[PDB]
A paper describes a structure:
The ABC transporter [name] plays a central role in the biogenesis of membrane-integrated and soluble cytochromes. Here, we used cellular, biochemical, structural and computational methods to characterize the structure and function of the heterodimeric bacterial ABC transporter [name]. We provide multi-level evidence that [name] is a heme transporter required for functional maturation of cytochrome bd, a pharmaceutically relevant drug target. Each subunit is composed of a membrane domain formed by six transmembrane α-helices (TMH), an N-terminal cytoplasmic elbow helix oriented parallel to the membrane plane and a cytoplasmic NBD.
Of the two constructed Walker B variants, only CydDCE500Q could be isolated in sufficient yield, purity and stability. The nucleotide and substrate-free, inward-facing conformation of [name] IFasisolatedapo, obtained in as isolated conditions, exhibits canonical features of type IV ABC transporters. In contrast to the turnover dataset of CydDCE500Q, biochemically defined CydDCE500Q cryo-EM samples revealed conformational heterogeneity reflected by structures of IFasisolatedapo, IFconfinedheme and Occreturnapo states.
Residue numbers in the entry:
A (entry chain C): 1 to 564
B (entry chain D): 4 to 568
Amino acid sequence: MRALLPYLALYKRHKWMLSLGIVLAIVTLLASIGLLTLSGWFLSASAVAGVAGLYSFNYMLPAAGVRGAAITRTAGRYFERLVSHDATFRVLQHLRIYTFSKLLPLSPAGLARYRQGELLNRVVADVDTLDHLYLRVISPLVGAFVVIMVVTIGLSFLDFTLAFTLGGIMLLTLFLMPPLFYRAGKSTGQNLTHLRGQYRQQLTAWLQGQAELTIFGASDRYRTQLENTEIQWLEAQRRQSELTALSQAIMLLIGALAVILMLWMASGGVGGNAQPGALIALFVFCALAAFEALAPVTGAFQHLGQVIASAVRISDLTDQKPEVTFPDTQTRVADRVSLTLRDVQFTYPEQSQQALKGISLQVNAGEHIAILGRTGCGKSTLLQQLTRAWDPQQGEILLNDSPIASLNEAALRQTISVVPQRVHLFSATLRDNLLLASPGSSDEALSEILRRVGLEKLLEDAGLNSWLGEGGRQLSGGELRRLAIARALLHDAPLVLLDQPTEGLDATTESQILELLAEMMREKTVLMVTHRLRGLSRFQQIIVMDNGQIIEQGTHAELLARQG
Amino acid sequence: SRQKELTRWLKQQSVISQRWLNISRLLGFVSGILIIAQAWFMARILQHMIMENIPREALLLPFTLLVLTFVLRAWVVWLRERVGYHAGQHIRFAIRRQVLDRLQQAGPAWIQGKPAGSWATLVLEQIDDMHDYYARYLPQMALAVSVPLLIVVAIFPSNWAAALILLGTAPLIPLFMALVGMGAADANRRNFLALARLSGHFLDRLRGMETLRIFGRGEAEIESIRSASEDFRQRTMEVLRLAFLSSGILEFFTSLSIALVAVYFGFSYLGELDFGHYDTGVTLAAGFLALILAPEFFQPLRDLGTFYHAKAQAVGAADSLKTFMETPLAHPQRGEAELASTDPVTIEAEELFITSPEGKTLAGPLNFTLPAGQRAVLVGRSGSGKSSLLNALSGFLSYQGSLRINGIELRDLSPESWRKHLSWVGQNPQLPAATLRDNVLLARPDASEQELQAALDNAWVSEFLPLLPQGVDTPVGDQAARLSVGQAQRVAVARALLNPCSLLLLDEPAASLDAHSEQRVMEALNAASLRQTTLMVTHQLEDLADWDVIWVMQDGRIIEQGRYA
């Protein structure tokens, strides 16, 4: 279709490696057809000549052709598999960069409406199946078409009415069987995918709700409709396996019609010859050997639908506009912050909650604001506006008497270092996990900062060479929390936003971090957002808020009196 | 040792459809027979009109028979892998019934161990990985040994030299694959670690884009994707130079065989070579039979190469499935007794141990008595097995000890009829019905609407009904039709209170709920905990003064048993 237009421009970056992988597919298929066609003719020509015509018949040339066609068949297929797979991996790099460059400016906002679980696993499975457009679809379709044309052109030097029936049948199934079978199996492809995700959600809600289904007795009758979805789902997989049966049986009948037509028509006469002799087998063995060019064709076009499916599931995901835009004013980050937001009344999309009811607070440079609010207060939503995940409507956020919107992304990210509640281990070497904060940091600085934070068990063995994340030295909560703080210390931003630094930590670690925060993040404006009441005594200011509104503010006291 | 043991498992599963896996072997033999019949008829026709110049219409009988051999082949091909699918569907349908029977019986205690996403790859992805092994690999593994051997038997009476070119490559193909298999397996272990941490590199960076933006590394992790994609290509293109050499060996011997057959026959008809034929001049029809069948000899082994990838994934998917069925499980004993009355029951326990399905004891020796129809809150430290006692009373955990319900040991009680007197309100709200109207009526789906309305307002689920688009029948599926946590919990309360119960269990109902709903959840339950004996585990120590008994549970033991004194 036309959904592939943005992605066919990525295949054009490497267009001489994809063309070489198709030319080698044509050469290999022409060598397979030529080897059997020449072998079929060589047997007939020599048998007719017989012993009497030994000296008259020149067998050296056909004997060199079978050796030549056999070598280019084996070497051609080896290099066609190498060149076409190598070009597939090169385009894969361009598909991944293109997908990542598009999903990045909309990382917090656009992907929030979907669910991160399936969405992120779907993008990887759709980029992987866009990468297989060349091998599954283009290479078999274009390799077959040129092979059909060259065979038809080559056989027209012998008989015109014979080359256009073998070429005519072969072309009439390259353009008819793939569409007639994509159209025949389109409902099943939709029905099967709908029933697969329907069984998945009926199974997840049957497993996750097994405690609440067993007690009320519905565990048996909610499995009965779970097994009736599978019965319907398995009947939509059989109907898809009966279109592969019909396509292989029909392709065997069309390759049988061409062989039988060549036996009948070419025996009547080949090129105005009453007794063609050895030319009967040249056309019969061409029809026999020319239909493995059409073996991949019918399963290639159904693959185009799956590629069309995945080419639009990404081209709408990557074409939704970014929530915020960063003007490239080329500003310079200041040494101090003095964060001030006069008024911020912000509401989520498709939500009437309106978490910020127009709050106001002023932070001076070096202060240690500690916003307190129970769960559901939308206190973390305040930290979203400061990093500009969402821009507020009818709100004013200023940063050193300059609005947050005026700062370019290159300087805003350097002005504010935030430690998120969910800290992500990048599944890379520990040196590559903390150089994310500050790329220019020397190797000595990494060890020192990782020491002062208290992560000494990481530097004990292979401290900067060990592999963290998946398939490596996984970190635990409270040992991963010191990594988020370690990154914020490398980043050295004047403002430090902490989002629940001690949400799930025991007494001994929480006490360390609160001192860990105050000792090192001492000259830096800190705006810490928690629902815990322990360490607020060292903060120069405390903000107590409920349902996006400031109730108890200006309390230099340890905590809200009632909260104690 | 293990991979051999997994393959033996895949054989034990392939018994439901052994009838369907025998017709794929039989139709492989029949499809092999029709190839010789096709090839022999074509040679008979071709020789007649080439050597004996017999016209088209005098060969009308072989043409009529050659069509049948072509129609029969197409029928067998259509018939052969419809039988193959029917074979592979029956393993998938039978095993998926065994997996679900293993999960339903294991109960919610064992199910909750893993995320429901990792359970639904076992039931959906792992099991469907095994179809193309019983449907396409196993049938083809036996068509790759019959058809090549059946073709040689057909050629041998004609020539022992044309049937020796084909049979000559039979030992050489697996011999040369082993030589290239040493180099391949060397690169499959050197590059195995690097390609395991580079394959999941994109999804690694693609997830955690929120951490990449907040540090400004968005433009510098494009270069990482560029280096992790250039390094994954170079390493895979080292593995593939050897995986396409083993594949291309079969393509080398299928064209050497056609070249040798064509040259040997072509030279034999000229007089240079005369060793193959049985002292009778080799005929044109004897050279077409061997040339037509030379590509058909290697086709079964070529298809087997493409379907061989299904062999590996069905063994990997048999590793996850086999260990799942070989985990020992301790599950509650199926009782047979019943409850005489629906009057609220009395709980009693002495030296009670609660055993996990894994086999460990969560709650140590604990003894308590709960008189009929008296609420009793159970508060304790986190991780101290306080929630395990609620599961053991529900019948989800097996216990060694004494736990009798109303004077009858809980082991003897039939779960189907014991849970008719039981109601529960979990910590996280889990709504398994399609519509919000059927979630409330989950206890009994045919209850009168007049009664339902009295149950809806009791739990105060009706106050936020207008906010929902469709009202009572608003779809409540987890995707795009959700409710608030304090809203999907107030409908779990209505589900619990619709049908009166003898024992009602509460597992931290007011957790991670907004202050607005927490007020209406509790006072809906604080009035529902008096009609029947209630055992609540609460996180908040506040406002428990009007609770008959308090048990403090530390390390799975009742240490402080008091009345909020």
